[PDB]
Symmetry: D2
Subunit: 275 residues, 4 copies
């Protein structure tokens, strides 16, 4: 239940979900290192997060392009060297550059998404895992997506790669349980971030998501932060290998239909293939 | 978020249910435990009263969940206690026989079905009515790893718990519009009185440990922690989930009770020969 | 691989069961159809006899699968016909009521449970006994997309069919050592007499089509084709599978019967208000 | 039920499963193009496959490195131009170069596996799909693995990438159903090929697989070929988006434990992380 005097690494800690997770931990008295691509945002987030955690919290940043393994490895060394032990990780770094039919998918955009999500995650887990095993245990939380649990027509590499990441969390849980390192995935549904204010505020797509979602609201960053913190905590010490949706129940229905956005740009025939 | 709230816990007289009740009482909640054995329910109350005051309170009503009318009466009693029912943790259920599918004791199978499938439906049906009228709540059904991974020779148990998990998800679909969340927890091997048979066997104990990534057995607190989280406002966007608390055993397989069952049935019987 | 073999088909008097029976007869198999309605079973026999000779043959026995003794008697009859039972396609089952979980007709729910959970177990239990003694076989259980994707307001149907799918997998685990394969098929919307309500509604018909990647409704032949493949030696390394034949509807969602149910129950009732 | 006068593309058609699938189709009277990396094997397989299909069958090859999209696109043009229509695809090309703990995984080997399985599959599906949509429909069958359905400790990228591929088949099925293009995945268990005679014939690993497998035998290439042919055929014309194991029921138990092979090479501590 407590996080005081524990140290965590948070990737994509500069905005959206990662920032919320970092906020939560620092406010609970944890030491956090946030890593991400943009030193501007990272620095900004740090001065802000520092206001929280008058409760013993601490915050640091290291700019890191997680598609380069050396940079990931260095960041993991630094967070571990901070107090000597790395208690956990929340991996929120990851992206999506594709939107369109599989038959016309931009292969460079696809390959970038694979590198970021699949390889990026592997580097973070590989190196974080080494220290958590040496430290006598810990908890790794991967942030996936409902795109992995429910097909999102025209999202190309997003759900494909997030499915890989979910499998990698389960594989690692299997391998690392003997070392008391728990590994779990969270798949958020529609969460309100500045990143996705186009969708959340659009009449057609907000309406489609709402019809797919049993609970009558959209998600919030705090919803995902709460699950991550629970899974990092000792209250989940027998929970590993799980893949858990924080999505208002959307996985019980279907992924969203982005027709209304895409039909005027691609035409209906392209959306069922047909080049 | 437990302090000013009231919860129903079925099967609250021992094991998982009792742990859940104890955690909620400790947090300041009011809890009504119900179950078949009045001696055990009354004893659990006396024990849990010791968890005293964050202002928590505990009551019991003997209830046979195979009887819909008694179940509805229990739901009326918990609801009238402070005027609103905030959540349910449904731990009542079990099974009565290990053996090959070809030798299933049909009356025991029917009993397990009645208890697990029908009993869960009645609790859900009437708890949902009140949680809808009251403006929302959280229903947690306790299932088992027997539903997620085949347990050879467990017959009705895994079958009925899979039915229950589907019910939890169907109910989440139907009830989300009324702010009633419904989730399932599947425990792995949890240390209780009900598990002394696995405990006394080197073969069975070893088999579970080999099937379990984390190098320990589960505790009732582990399941109680998950249940409380899912009841809390910290899980307010979580519904329709089926979540294992099992040390990662679902990543491997169900246990193999061959060592125990071979001397009773014979090897041929365990692959269906009569 | 059907020519010199004998199969039991439950619910063989109409719909999916009858299609399955017809395909097997056409291929030269002997088929016993069983079911509750003797007029319909007898009429199906007369029809299927027309499928004549690749040397195929068809018989019927009226059987109430909620009675284990009648079920065992049907399994004895099919087995004694040519001395070995090679497989089963279990299509008998159904449901009796659409409505919110908060207004479930408990007697109809129990009936659906008895028919689907208990009835399937009896057929499986006794068919498995003979298929084990005979040196192997293939058991195909027919389930439904209601088990793979929540169908709001379908109550016991999806719940019980999920129980059935778990049973198929448990039985595959137990019985593989005796070369008895057990698999489940989940059909989507299939064109039969049982679906005229969806057919007559623009709203419901449109909703299914929107939920279905392939731009057509399912046919009984589609399900019969899958069943035959799974019975065949071409599927000899396939067991424990649960396979949809649904035009890809499982990739989207279950149907939304709101248009039909709103005028009966009201909108508030459909989210659990009583 | 028939395959006469239909044309199919088979990737990895030069050995193992692909060769068996190609054999099956040609023998049933189909035209097949087999593609793969090694022109020696491809040519060999063609002269052999030509003996079969006195029943109207036809066989061709094009050497193709499926990690290069241009080469994949050319092969798809050629098979389609052959008779004017491409009726289906069975995608068996794919590999696995990793064996060891996630904490010590060779990142170059990992990245190669991702490129082959994830990107390779996408290229094949993208371009094959274009023609099948234009042709009025068809059937794409992806060959995955039980490594995707059940965690295989120490298999690193194999199950991770095969999980991605399964998701991609489901996404494509969702997108392309409107065009009558069905897309499905097969996950084989232990299949006897020359590739894996080390495992299938080893006492410890054969024994472990056998205990995990309800049916008392190992798989055969014909078992997978039969499922693929059924899914290509009109007898499966309402079957799309499915992910189907041909594994003797192994998915009901667990993936294999390669401890006996790996412990003497890595030590027990490395196998639970600990570098
Ligand atoms: Cl009790
Ligand atoms: Cl009938
Ligand atoms: Na209180
Ligand atoms: Na015959």
């Amino acid at each position: 239940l407590s996080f005081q005097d524990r140290t965590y690494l948070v990737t994509g800690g500069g905005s959206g979900i990662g920032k919320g997770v970092a906020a939560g931990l620092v406010a609970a008295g944890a030491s956090v290192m946030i890593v991400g691509r943009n030193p501007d945002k990272l620095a900004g987030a740090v001065q802000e997060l520092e206001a929280l955690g008058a409760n013993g919290g601490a915050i640091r940043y290291e700019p890191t392009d997680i598609t380069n393994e050396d940079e990931t490895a260095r960041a993991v060394d630094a967070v571990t060297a901070w107090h000597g032990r790395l208690h956990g990780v929340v991996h929120c770094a990851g992206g999506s550059e594709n939107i369109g039919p599989i038959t016309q998918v931009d292969s460079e955009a696809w390959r970038r998404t694979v590198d970021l999500n699949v390889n990026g995650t592997m580097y973070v887990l590989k190196h974080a895992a080494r220290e958590m095993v040496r430290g006598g245990g810990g908890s790794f939380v991967g942030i996936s997506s409902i795109a992995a649990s429910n097909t999102h027509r025209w999202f190309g590499a997003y759900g494909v790669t997030k499915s890989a990441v979910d499998h990698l969390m389960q594989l690692a849980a299997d391998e690392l349980g003997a070392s008391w390192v728990r590994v779990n995935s969270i798949r958020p549904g529609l969460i309100r971030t500045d990143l996705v204010a186009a969708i959340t505020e659009s009449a057609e797509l907000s309406s489609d998501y709402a019809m797919c979602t049993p609970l009558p609201r959209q998600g919030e960053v705090e919803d995902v932060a709460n699950m991550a913190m629970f899974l990092l905590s000792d209250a989940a010490s027998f929970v590993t290998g799980q893949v858990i949706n924080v999505d208002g129940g959307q996985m019980l229905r279907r992924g969203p239909d982005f027709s209304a956005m895409l039909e005027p740009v691609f035409g209906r025939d392209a959306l069922r293939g047909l080049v």
